[PDB]
Amino acid sequence: MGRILFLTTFMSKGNKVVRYLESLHHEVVICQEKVHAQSANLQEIDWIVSYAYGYILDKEIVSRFRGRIINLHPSLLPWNKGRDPVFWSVWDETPKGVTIHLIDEHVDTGDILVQEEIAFADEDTLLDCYNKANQAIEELFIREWENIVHGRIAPYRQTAGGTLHFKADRDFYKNLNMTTVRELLALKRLCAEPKKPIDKTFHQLFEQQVEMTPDHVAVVDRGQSLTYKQLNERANQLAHHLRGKGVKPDDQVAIMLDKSLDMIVSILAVMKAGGAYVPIDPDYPGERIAYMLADSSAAILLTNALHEEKANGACDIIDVHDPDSYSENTNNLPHVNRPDDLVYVMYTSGSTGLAKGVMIEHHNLVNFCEWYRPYFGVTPADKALVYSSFSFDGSALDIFTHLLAGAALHIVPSERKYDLDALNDYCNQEGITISYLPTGAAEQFMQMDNQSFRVVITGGDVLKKIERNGTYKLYNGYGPTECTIMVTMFEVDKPYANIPIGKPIDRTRILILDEALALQPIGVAGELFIVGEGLGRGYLNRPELTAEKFIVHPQTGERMYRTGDRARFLPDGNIEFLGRLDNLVKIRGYRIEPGEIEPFLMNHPLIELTTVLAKEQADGRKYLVGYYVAPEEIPHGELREWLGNDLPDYMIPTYFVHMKAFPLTANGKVDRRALPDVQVAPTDELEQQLAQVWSHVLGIPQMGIDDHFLERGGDSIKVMQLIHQLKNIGLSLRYDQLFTHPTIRQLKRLLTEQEPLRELDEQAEYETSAVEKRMYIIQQQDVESIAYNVVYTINFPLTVDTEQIRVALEQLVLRHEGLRSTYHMRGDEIVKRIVPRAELSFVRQTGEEESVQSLLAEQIKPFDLAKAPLLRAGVIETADKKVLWFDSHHILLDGLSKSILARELQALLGQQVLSPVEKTYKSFARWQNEWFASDEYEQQIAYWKTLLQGELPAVQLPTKKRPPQLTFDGAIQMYRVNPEITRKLKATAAKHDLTLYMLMLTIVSIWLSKMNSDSNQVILGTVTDGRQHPDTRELLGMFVNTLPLLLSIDHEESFLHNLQQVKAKLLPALQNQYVPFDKILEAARVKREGNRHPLFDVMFMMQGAPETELESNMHHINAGISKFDLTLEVLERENGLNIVFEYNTHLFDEGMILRMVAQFEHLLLQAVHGLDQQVKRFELV
């Protein structure tokens, strides 16, 4: 009876509730926009029911309707008041449920009417939880509404407590809506602050150690040594003098000495006096020494007579070999330091810009030392090497960690540092048990037969070798100078493709963030941020740069450091290093980390060291150069063949540079900036002309006469491009001929023997293509169907202007006649008309991440093929993103058209000008129709007549009972082939004259065979370009053609043999692909009858890598439709394969399809490793 005002996020929210209320003969007025106290909308309103309402109701509205305002909140109040209640119930691990409550003045604080608990399974994604809760609260309302209107329910006040969250409280977690409950909590453990500080300075701890082990050896240099007591006394003597010369807390004192007893005395003396030491290696270039002394505020300098002159008399010199530099007093100084005072300043390499002084405090170093000693179980019996230059923090590790453990430091002889055979002898002679070595030196030392080491720590660069002649444990540590030596540590227990850098040290946490500084899910790559007790004070005399790299996170408020390193968390907690963010480069349509090639090339027997770099040429294109250290230069073809075993062509360096040894740097890393630069051929006239075409199609500088097309990065798309370019020389080439003559040499002989698309004039009406007719006929049978609608979405940031998007789309309508085309019936002829302008249906909406799928499904509606434009668009704006969507009819937007539609939209959004389109779809339609009357068409159609005349193999799939009629209810599952496996698949195909499509098609056909008790033949469908004329490569319209592939599988033969046979049947099919599908059914004597599709129930489609980034961010949305029993679409994304399993829901449930996917994966893994294995040995289980 009463009139109900319904308030919601959008008009569509809580449709079940609105439907139940109306069934009871309530009048339901829906309002999603803000309501005011004095409003017309509160006219004859008896009840206000709000449900995800985005505005607060004024104090006047609540008092006027007191007792009549009901709200549906999907949380167990008082927990999780305000926005995103379901998300916070999971993240803050609160009681879970849903609540119907009265509305009062404040947010979610009114007395409760009904409350119910709810449980989210560990495997449910947050989107599942959002929907599961909403579903629960809506049902609860429908059950208790009767009790609510009649006022039977006794309201009970809320308990004090609970959390009120706001819109911006979620910003940090915006990327986590697709994770599971188990995954989300897992991320919380790693990336969240806990709920004992450091209260000591290093020399406090050192002095403590001396009283415990006074007579233990502390430092050894060749034959001379000092005990902990002796070292302590002498350092105190120098420290009394230094503090007498004015050294105050935070004061910098330069030290310029060679590794020696004097160096360790000098370091400790500067700490005891109260200052921080600035190490200046005397072997540095004079330019750098002067820079370090000048940029540093150090007034005092400790040095020798030897290196005295290198200071240019700039500082007050204190000679460590002058007796008057040492006081008589041997006692420890009165302590004047605090753990937050500087302990040392070290400078970054002056390569990438200028050298910066890194300021490290006492508590930074103490934290590392106290972690290190128990982590490695360092005892007073251990002996450590002082190997690193004392200008790098690898030295701080050598000296400070082991001095607080009572161990003995061993100055490495200069003459034995670079001679690892000699160093190994010194270590075996003196019993050296643990030390740190930079990665470069570490990898070389692994060849030495060592018996003394117990632990070897390495770091600084990517570890690429672990095989070693020694019984010692190998550790991989990672960290920037800006965070004290190391922040993560990993024990190398077994081989890895990418040796992890491990887990954080004490009082340290690592975060993986995106560019917006928001958390990444576990297993997703982002920028590595460091938090905790390791972060130094900042950069000396560069406070702007310090605030830029030592950021205070805008949401968490914690101080973190931007490392610039790309990294990723593994499921086991270990971190994985993925290179520098700057080293990502696009090579011929693929975004790659060149460092991922090095382990493959290094595995070569004659190659010891490798580094691959990206270099630019005049064109602006990038190319790869693989440098290697080998005894002798290895021929280019041998290295290309070696890598071709595992990598596609685009990941094989175009040039290889041999070198005796790589130029290192003082820290001990390979010097990337110092690597040198780069220093049968066609002889015939036609051969040169062909090489120029190949070099442009494949994006390659020089093409060999015998180079195989597929070996050098060729695929079917570029096969078509090749035929296009050749006709720009008057040379006609057929698709099948490119695969029977895949080299320039074989193509020469074929072309020694042997028409633009003419735009049509203005006409009232134009012919249609064969494919356009079919689409129009299908749509006319079920007039309001949507099985042939195409829907995409693009997640845009909130900064993107909603108007520019709309304007870009409306510009595309003017540009492409297809967007201004309509289809009408003229007698018994389907005919096309073109309008000069057409209004674009564009919609703006505000929704929620949980609701986007629902909001969008409402927009998807049938098209009137006679009304233009045949495309709609809209933007659904959620809290953290703007979701652009557009729904088009398939008669206009095929697969390649989507790539074009994406390329231009990205350019229009980037403020770039597009030259007008040359040709129109009209002209191709007429050209193709008139071509049907030629001899070549009669040839093609004859191939299918003879192929499909005999008995056809009927593939049976393992389905539930088939519906009696053709059904189209569908769902989707997705299987991801990681980059490593995809890289192997592509290499295998090219190595054996196969495209990736050909290989995947064979795995699929075998898969269908195994499910048919190992049948000899299988029949499946596929899709082809349809771009018959070369001048249609940039047009919008439907060209794709559907082809039946009749394949044979010989289970007695090898996988390789079947690949070749499938290739043999595919090429003739593609040779005659330009026959309309309706004519192929007519030629096979088959009609669309029964509950099975004409020729095949399984469809296999494939799409190459995206041409542009905007296309990568396009996501094809499925509105629960399956045109066939089962469709497999392989899409190349993120250097991997996303294989979509679109399936009929009446034939499969989620269970069956998930087991079929697992079987398919298992079959794929066997097939890629089992090239010569007989196909019958492959098993699904």
Ligand SMILES: Nc1nc(=O)c2c([nH]1)NC[C@@H](CNc1ccc(C(=O)N[C@@H](CCC(=O)O)C(=O)O)cc1)N2C=O
């Ligand atoms: N008086 C009242 N009590 C309620 O419990 C209640 C309402 N009104 N109206 C609807 C809904 C609460 N919905 C919302 C939606 C958005 C914000 C909002 O704008 N939050 C801002 C900060 C709010 C402020 O400015 O103080 C934010 O940034 O999150 C608040 C409440 N609700 C029961 O479900």
Ligand SMILES: Nc1ncnc2c1ncn2[C@@H]1O[C@H](COP(=O)(O)CP(=O)(O)OP(=O)(O)O)[C@@H](O)[C@H]1O
């Ligand atoms: N165990 C490890 N594995 C892989 N890379 C590592 C690593 N340890 C360090 N690195 C790399 O080397 C960086 C740390 O080196 P640092 O000693 O801090 C000076 P740098 O950054 O190499 O050059 P710079 O002197 O111009 O600052 C890291 O940011 C990372 O890129």
Ligand SMILES: *P(=O)(=O)O[C]C([C])([C])[C]([O])C(=O)[N][C][C]C(=O)[N][C][C][N]C(=O)[C]([N][C]=O)[C]([C])[C]
């Ligand atoms: P070659 O590498 O051996 O490739 C052989 C092919 C696959 C036959 C090649 O010649 C080819 O034609 N590739 C393009 C085929 C194609 O268009 N795949 C995607 C088709 N998908 C759609 O049309 C969808 N609409 C928009 O995307 C829809 C029908 C699902």
Ligand SMILES: CC(C)[C@H](N)C(=O)O
């Ligand atoms: C120990 C230290 C030298 C660390 N490996 C670094 O990369 O700086």
Ligand SMILES: [Mg+2]
């Ligand atoms: Mg650096």
